[PDB]
Write a structure and sequence with these properties.
It is a single chain. This protein is an all-alpha fold. The protein has a single domain, classed as Up-down Bundle (Histone Acetyltransferase, Chain A), CATH 1.20.920.10. Helices cover 48% and strands 0% of the residues. Helix 1 runs antiparallel to helix 3, helix 1 runs antiparallel to helix 5 and helix 3 packs antiparallel against helix 4. The protein is globular and about 65 Å long. Bound molecules: the ligand COc1cc2onc(C)c2cc1NS(=O)(=O)c1cc(Br)ccc1OC. The ligand COc1cc2onc(C)c2cc1NS(=O)(=O)c1cc(Br)ccc1OC binds next to helix 4 and helix 5. Belongs to the BET family. This is Bromodomain-containing protein 4. It is found in: Nucleus; Chromosome.
């Protein structure tokens, strides 16, 4: 038989939402700080780049990524959420950062470059979180 299963192909999942008109939203001092200080400082760090967009499993040849990671999250998504006032409180935003870090620790191994990057960003995150109003 001449069906060799070269199609259908994979794809990335759709990315997490950044707008939801029926979701309750507020602007708090803590969320403004999360955008103005926490996010915007992590974003400029030399280790931010793998975390600035959803994991593109196709491009990066990570065909198992979305077999393993069911709640993807990245700082591009977090940044678009903050810009769109998507959140109700700081806790929602913080859980997204925690998700992103945890995903990286699940998928990869202790000592991997990506994990060293994640660990460093998390360190800085935790320090900036201690300065929250
Ligand atoms: C194994 O490659 C990756 C694992 C990852 O877990 N989370 C993300 C995001 C992520 C990205 C890659 N691929 S990559 O090309 O961005 C990459 C980054 C580093 Br720092 C080290 C290796 C690497 O791919 C081989």
């Amino acid at each position: 038989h001449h069906h060799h299963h070269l199609v259908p192909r994979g794809s990335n999942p759709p990315p997490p939402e950044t707008s939801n008109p029926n979701k309750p939203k507020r602007q708090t001092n803590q969320l403004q700080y999360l955008l103005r200080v926490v996010l915007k400082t992590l974003w400029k760090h030399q280790f931010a780049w793998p975390f600035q967009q959803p994991v593109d499993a196709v491009k990066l040849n990570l065909p198992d990524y979305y077999k393993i990671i069911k709640t993807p999250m990245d700082m591009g998504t977090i940044k678009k959420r903050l810009e769109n006032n998507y959140y109700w409180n700081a806790q929602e935003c913080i859980q997204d950062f925690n998700t992103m870090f945890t995903n990286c620790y699940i998928y990869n191994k202790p000592g991997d470059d990506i994990v060293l990057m994640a660990e460093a960003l998390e360190k800085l995150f935790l320090q900036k979180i201690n300065e929250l109003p």
